[PDB]
């Protein structure tokens, strides 16, 4: 039950006077197979455990903080089956060129709503985007480090070329709470793309700039369970 994704995800109440803006990010290599191979790309990204522990067998490229803003991109590769260096959008706070054609990316932190009510998050990706959302499902309130690998069934998932290449998740959220979120991305080859949008009833248009929504909090000994609750 604890890590299963739900329509009423659990949020958190960190004790934080001055919250740190943006999500944390980790970038890892995703090397091609030997030049001339067909298939040319490493298939590891489809392994159920690649997003849990497999990516750790790859090279750590960087740890980045303060990922905040519009994180969506479409990277158009000039050639397929070819590693090419380019840059991520500004939101990612990572200015140096990386292999945009082939890389793994993990984001985590907390999502703070602006208006209490239903939130629909929509995702699409090339090649892979797996999203967890809520305490337990993503990780435990102010206990991320100790629960980081224990995420549950994805609230949304998108895999290019599969039967689910676009997805969404609809959750009821309270604007006073901060919700654990985990976003796992992979580009295996060629084009790379990530789209996350948010729809609520308070705006007829989607939200694409998450500047005001993404936070990071330090873990604590006792954790920071949500202090707003409506269940009976």
Ligand X SMILES: CC(=O)N[C@@H]1[C@@H](O)[C@H](O[C@@H]2O[C@H](CO)[C@H](O)[C@H](O)[C@H]2O)[C@@H](CO)O[C@H]1O
Among the listed ranges 17-25, 59-67, 187-195, 207-215, the one in contact with ligand X (CB under 6 A) is: 187-195
31 contacts: CB under 8 Å, gap ≥ 6: 42, 58, 83, 102
Query: Rule CB under 5 A: is residue 190 a binding residue for Ca ion?
Result: yes
Q: Indicate which single residue of 45, 106, 112, 127 sits in contact with Ca ion (rule: CB under 5 A).
A: 127
∠ Cα 122 192 138 (to 5°): 45
Residues listed for the chain: 232
Among the listed ranges 1-9, 42-50, 91-99, 182-190, the one in contact with ligand X (CB under 6 A) is: 182-190
For residue 174, the partner it binds in ligand X, Ca ion, none, with Cβ less than 5 to 8 A by kind, is none
Query: Rule CB under 6 A: is residue 127 a binding residue for ligand X?
Result: yes
Instruction: Using the minimum distance from each CB to ligand X, give the nearer residue, 132 or 190.
Output: 190
Q: How far is the CB of 19 from ligand X (least distance, A)?
A: 36
CB 125 within 8 A of CB 139: no
- Residue 205: count of CB within 10 angstroms of its CB: 7
Q: For residue 149, say whether it is annotated as part of any ligand binding site.
A: no
Structure tokens at 39: 């298939």
Query: Rule CB under 6 A: is residue 191 a binding residue for ligand X?
Result: yes
Q: Name the nearest CA neighbour of 124 among 88, 162, 160, 92.
A: 160
d(CA 12, CA 211): 19
Q: For residue 218, say whether it is annotated as part of any ligand binding site.
A: no
Among the listed ranges 11-19, 114-122, 185-193, 201-209, the one in contact with ligand X (CB under 6 A) is: 185-193
Binding positions for ligand X, 53-112, rule CB under 6 A: 80-81
Instruction: Using the minimum distance from each CB to Ca ion, give the nearer residue, 16 or 165.
Output: 165
For residue 81, the partner it binds in ligand X, Ca ion, none, with Cβ less than 5 to 8 A by kind, is ligand X
Instruction: Using the minimum distance from each CB to Ca ion, give the nearer residue, 97 or 161.
Output: 161
Spell out where the chain is interrupted, by the residue before each break (C to N > 2.5 A): none
Helix (H) or strand (E) holding 118: strand 117-126
List, in sequence order, every residue forming a beta bridge with 121; answer none if it has no partner: 169, 198
Helix (H) or strand (E) holding 167: strand 166-173
Query: Rule CB under 6 A: is residue 155 a binding residue for ligand X?
Result: no
Among the listed ranges 131-139, 184-192, 207-215, 224-232, the one in contact with ligand X (CB under 6 A) is: 184-192
């Amino acid at each position: 039950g604890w890590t299963d994704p739900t329509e009423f995800p659990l949020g958190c109440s960190p004790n934080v006077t001055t919250p740190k803006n943006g999500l944390s990010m980790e970038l890892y290599s995703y090397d091609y197979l030997k030049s001339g191979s067909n298939p040319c790309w490493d298939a590891a990204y489809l392994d159920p455990n690649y997003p849990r522990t497999g990516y750790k067998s790859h090279r750590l490229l960087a740890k980045v903080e303060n990922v905040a803003g519009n994180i969506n991109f479409y990277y158009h590769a000039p050639m397929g089956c070819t590693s090419l260096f380019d840059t991520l959008p500004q939101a990612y706070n990572y200015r140096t060129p990386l292999t945009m054609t082939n890389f793994t990316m993990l984001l985590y932190g907390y999502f703070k709503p602006k208006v209490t009510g239903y939130h629909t998050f929509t995702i699409s990706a090339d090649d892979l985007l797996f999203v967890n959302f809520g305490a337990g499902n993503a990780f435990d309130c102010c206990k991320r480090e100790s629960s980081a690998d224990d995420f549950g069934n994805y609230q949304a998932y998108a895999v290019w070329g599969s039967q689910t290449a676009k997805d969404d998740l609809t959750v009821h959220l309270d604007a006073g709470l901060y919700y654990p979120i985990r976003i796992f991305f992979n580009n295996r080859d060629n084009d790379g793309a990530l789209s996350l949008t948010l729809k609520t009833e308070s705006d007829p248009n989607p939200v694409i700039d998450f500047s005001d929504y993404f936070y990071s909090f330090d873990d604590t000994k006792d954790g920071c369970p949500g202090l707003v609750s409506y269940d009976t």
